[PDB]
Symmetry: C2
Subunit: 308 residues, 2 copies
């Protein structure tokens, strides 16, 4: 058959699939006190995308559409367009538009607008709160708060470029964002739909292995921790390769080129997430040039050597 592979990139060479910044470290911990159900960076080893997951490492947490002012406030409503500027179809069987943020928090960035008749051009600091009742991307509308009350024109193309997250310093530190809480994609009191499955360890002593980045802080004492289940580069890779999963789990070894020895082994489940044999929280310590290597297909019950 066609052979399964993972990219020969370092953790640092790769990119977070849940927000557009690169990866920094591996991290493992216990996933029962919370719900690991991200909609971004979700893909099966045989190349099937899931949830709101899409291919561009850049168009994650971005928004395209036209805007309309909200009287006597500095808020704007954006009517969402598809990524190619085509119309957004809410009937499409997906939790929300592809790339929609998959966590509750206040994402701050910049609304940019280019005015078609004269190629005039403006840019304002803007924030979208995915917890807000006005955050209804699945319905094709989302609400931004803003620098100005007059600047943006109607019927002209508008882009939100995400930058970092934000938090209220008056209150409890690192209270937002909540990374493992999904937004109400369709507004309040309406069910999220077509979600990628929640994940968890299904073997004794195993914990999830997270690919972790630290989101930028515009202001406040945000909790900038952001873990994804698969590096975006892996989503991209699996999608291309579409190599048939031959067994329950793909056994990966993490190798150090420097010494040529294996540092640890892990399970890549065909569902598209990783587990390691370890108990407790741990930021993994790794050779900066170390990479993941696929070794064999093994079943539910292969016992992993411990991580350390």
């Amino acid at each position: 058959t066609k052979p399964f592979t993972v990219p020969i990139l370092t953790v640092e060479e790769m990119t977070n699939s849940r927000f557009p910044i690169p990866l920094e470290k591996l991290f493992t911990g216990p996933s029962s006190a919370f719900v690991v159900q991200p909609q971004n960076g979700r893909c099966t080893t045989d190349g099937a995308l899931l949830g709101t997951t899409q291919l561009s490492p850049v168009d994650i947490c971005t928004f395209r559409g036209d805007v309309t002012h909200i009287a006597g406030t500095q808020n704007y409503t954006m009517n969402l367009a598809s990524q190619n500027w085509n119309n957004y179809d809410p009937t499409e069987e997906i939790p929300a538009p592809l790339g929609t943020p998959d966590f509750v928090g206040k994402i701050q960035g910049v609304l940019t607008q280019t005015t078609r008749r004269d190629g005039s051009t403006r840019g304002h600091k803007a924030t979208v709160s995915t917890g807000s009742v006005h955050f209804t991307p699945k319905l094709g509308s989302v609400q931004f708060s803003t620098d100005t009350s007059n600047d943006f024109e109607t019927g002209q193309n508008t882009r939100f470029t995400p930058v970092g997250v934000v938090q209220d310093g008056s209150t409890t530190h690192q209270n937002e964002p909540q990374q493992w809480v999904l937004p109400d994609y369709s507004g309040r009191d309406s069910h999220n739909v077509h979600l990628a499955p929640a994940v968890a360890p299904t073997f004794p002593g195993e914990q999830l292995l997270f690919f972790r980045s630290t989101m930028p802080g515009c202001s406040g004492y945000p909790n900038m921790n952001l873990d994804c289940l698969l590096p975006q580069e892996w989503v991209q890779h699996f999608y291309q390769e579409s190599a048939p999963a031959q067994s329950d789990v793909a056994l990966l070894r993490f190798v150090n080129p420097d010494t040529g020895r294996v540092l640890f082994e892990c399970k890549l489940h065909k569902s598209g997430y990783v587990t390691v044999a370890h108990t407790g929280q741990h930021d993994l310590v790794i050779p900066p040039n170390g990479y993941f290597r696929f070794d064999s297909w093994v079943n539910q019950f292969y016992t992993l050597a411990p991580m350390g």
Copy 2:
């Protein structure tokens, strides 16, 4: 012989600009003799060798990491550049500038974000870097930002510039900037740019370069937001991984429309890492949104293409 050469099965829209972190939009072809096509980003050979300031992350293009220091009684800051992993920048490394450094003259506006190690405090201000400025000296490890505030950023604390769009003066001539096909003075005035990826051009009759085009976001004024790269970032990434030996100076590509099955046009992918098509004049290509590039065979300098239309 060897590992077979391939190009990714992505659409233009599925792919990403290699010269600024936004996705591709259209194919465009035109004449490349009135200007110098010598970008340092999205430059890679078909057998996987990165060139110029080209690097792998589609996100870390036109970004800057380092620490900052205020410039007395102005709202400008000087950033002392760090490598991508926050390690120290080595100007002795044989590269035009740090990897991912902007490869065009213009005013790039974004946001400087800073996080205070001790207490996890954060702040973020609107910022602009002008790559034409005499203070834009990335190869020496320093770059200058203009800013929202005069007191906020602390010294010795990690700082990140996240690019957003480009900018221009509305009082001045329109579309006069940025200048996409003009390299910055990577080492300041008074010093030569060094270790550049080669300039490129058509070397066959009737052929023009084929550009992978995006339109950069405009912050304000009337900027010229056109941005063409020679290879989609996804191709750089792909070639780097595959490292498949070029078997010829050129790889013949066909652009196929999958529902129909038919070929829309053919083009030459040169092992040097740029594309040409047989056509004379400017033209935004019109393509089936789900059409993709397909590698067909290795052919030599002199294979005659069939006109694009």
